[PDB]
Amino acid sequence: MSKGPAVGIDLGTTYSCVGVFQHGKVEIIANDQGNRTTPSYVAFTDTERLIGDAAKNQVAMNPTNTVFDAKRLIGRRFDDAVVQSDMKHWPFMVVNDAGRPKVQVEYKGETKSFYPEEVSSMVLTKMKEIAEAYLGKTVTNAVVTVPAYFNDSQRQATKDAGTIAGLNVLRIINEPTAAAIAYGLDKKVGAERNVLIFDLGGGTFDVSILTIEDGIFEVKSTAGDTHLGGEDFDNRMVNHFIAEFKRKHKKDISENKRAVRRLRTACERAKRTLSSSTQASIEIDSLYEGIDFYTSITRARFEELNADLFRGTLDPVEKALRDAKLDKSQIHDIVLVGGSTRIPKIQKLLQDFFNGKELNKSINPDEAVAYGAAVQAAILS
Amino acid sequence: GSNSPQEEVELKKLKHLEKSVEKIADQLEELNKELTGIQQGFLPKDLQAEALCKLDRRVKATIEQFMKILEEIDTLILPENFKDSRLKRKGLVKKVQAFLAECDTVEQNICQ
Numbered sequence: 001m002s003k004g005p006a007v008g009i010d011l012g013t014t015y016s017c018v019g020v021f022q023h024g025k026v027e028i029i030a031n032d033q034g035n036r037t038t039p040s041y042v043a044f045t046d047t048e049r050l051i052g053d054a055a056k057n058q059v060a061m062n063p064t065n066t067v068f069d070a071k072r073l074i075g076r077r078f079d080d081a082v083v084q085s086d087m088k089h090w091p092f093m094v095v096n097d098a099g100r101p102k103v104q105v106e107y108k109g110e111t112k113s114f115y116p117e118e119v120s121s122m123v124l125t126k127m128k129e130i131a132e133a134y135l136g137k138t139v140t141n142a143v144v145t146v147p148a149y150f151n152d153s154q155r156q157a158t159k160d161a162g163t164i165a166g167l168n169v170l171r172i173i174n175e176p177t178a179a180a181i182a183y184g185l186d187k188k189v190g191a192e193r194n195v196l197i198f199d200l201g202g203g204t205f206d207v208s209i210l211t212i213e214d215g216i217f218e219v220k221s222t223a224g225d226t227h228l229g230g231e232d233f234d235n236r237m238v239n240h241f242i243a244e245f246k247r248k249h250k251k252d253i254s255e256n257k258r259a260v261r262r263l264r265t266a267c268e269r270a271k272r273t274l275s276s277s278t279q280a281s282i283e284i285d286s287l288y289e290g291i292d293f294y295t296s297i298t299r300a301r302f303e304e305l306n307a308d309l310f311r312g313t314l315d316p317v318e319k320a321l322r323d324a325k326l327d328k329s330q331i332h333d334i335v336l337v338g339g340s341t342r343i344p345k346i347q348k349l350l351q352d353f354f355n356g357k358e359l360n361k362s363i364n365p366d367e368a369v370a371y372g373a374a375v376q377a378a379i380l381s
Numbered sequence: 382g383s384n385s386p387q388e389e390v391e392l393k394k395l396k397h398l399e400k401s402v403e404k405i406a407d408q409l410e411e412l413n414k415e416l417t418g419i420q421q422g423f424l425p426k427d428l429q430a431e432a433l434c435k436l437d438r439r440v441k442a443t444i445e446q447f448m449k450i451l452e453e454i455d456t457l458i459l460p461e462n463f464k465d466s467r468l469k470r471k472g473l474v475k476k477v478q479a480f481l482a483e484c485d486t487v488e489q490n491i492c493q
């Protein structure tokens with residue numbers, strides 16, 4: 001294979017995305033399964049190592065040996081409050097190796113430990129292979145994104161993950177900076193502009209305020225909730241339908257894991273439908289004890305069930321503005337990143353907070369960060 | 382006697398699912414035959430527990446495949462007038478559920 005162009009990779013907590021700037025435009029590259037985003041999952045079995053969709057697809061089968069959330073560990077010390085808190089909820093083992101966290105798994109019948117950058121290199125190897133499979137050319141150069149709050153150790157470890165994956169990391173750039181680059185906010189004529197990045201996706205909520213003066217990006221403030229996402233909105237819908245089944249049939253489906261999973265999957269789909277329709281219907285035959293569950297939910301009810309969570313997204317916005325020493329009227333551009341920003345109520349709440357100001361939302365919010373990184377990668381080529 | 386072309390679209394998705402169920406049911410049948418073999422006791426007893434527990438990954442893969450079939454079936458919306466599609470969906474869910482209860486029987490007899 002001949003030498004290909006440089007790529008932009010958004011290394012995410014739950015999913016990763018790879019893009020390429022070619023023919024004057026960014027193309028978001030689909031994986032082997034035809035998916036534009038790949039789960040940041042690595043599975044270790046008795047026979048193989050699985051990355052992405054193949055790793056996520058077998059998680060139920062191999063929960064302990066399926067690693068995810070490596071990004072929550074990368075560049076951190078074992079005794080970090082974040083590492084110690086997150087550990088309680090992971091099915092895989094996290095061990096201490098001289099102050100450093102390591103994931104401990106069973107791989108081909110052997111106990112093996114991996115540093116978070118070794119796990120993240122496996123995900124980066126997959127993104128590199130996804131790019132090569134599409135282009136039909138070798139891929140070496142890439143721009144990899146990191147959250148704006150990442151420290152020196154977290155940034156170095158992400159760069160190290162790229163080096164292990166055989167990538168030449170051209171630059172490491174902030175996720176909110178990548179999103180501002182995607183919308184070309186650094187190319188707009190005039191004085192300094194204040195940009196608010198509203199990132200609600202990949203199981204985290206990040207609000208960043210940037211000051212772009214003569215194309216130079218300055219992080220003024222970062223705020224958010226590290227454990228907020230679409231899964232929280234799904235849980236509210238699941239709870240609504242569990243209560244509804246109890247009211248209608250006087251039966252509790254909650255201790256039947258398969259019934260709860262069928263309902264949860266149906267709610268994830270229903271939530272997505274409610275971003276474009278005002279009603280979503282669900283038909284689940286023989287959900288529990290032979291009872292068919294045929295129901296529906298309106299966008300209004302979904303908004304009612306999640307009213308506190310949606311409104312609560314404005315608290316890190318106000319905190320970011322306060323820390324940046326800025327009034328909401330001083331924000332020139334608002335950018336929506338993450339899949340959950342597709343929710344019409346979230347858009348409505350945010351636009352109303354900014355007194356009817358139009359939102360930058362044209363670029364697919366799941367792909368905006370890889371998009372900006374692909375633009376940067378082409379610029380640095 | 383008001384069979385619609387639109388219902389043909391639905392019945393085709395269901396038929397495909399029925400075929401997928403047949404392939405997974407064949408894997409379950411093979412697992413059932415292997416589980417039965419080990420139960421005979423021709424293996425050294427000190428090694429019976431490990432052979433039974435070696436069937437765990439396969440049983441779990443079978444369960445997962447049936448769960449993914451149910452999740453796919455659950456995406457279907459069939460109007461009340463699609464009587465034949467509703468009966469095929471119902472029959473298929475019940476068949477998968479009876480296969481899942483057989484998988485559960487295997488899980489209760491291995492790694493114990």
Ligand SMILES: Cc1ccc2ncnc(N)c2c1
Nearest residue numbers: 230271272275339340342343
């Ligand atoms: C692709 C897609 C479509 C609609 C959505 N609605 C809400 N949250 C998401 N994460 C969504 C993703």
Ligand SMILES: [Cl-]
Nearest residue numbers: 028029030134
């Ligand atoms: Cl593609």
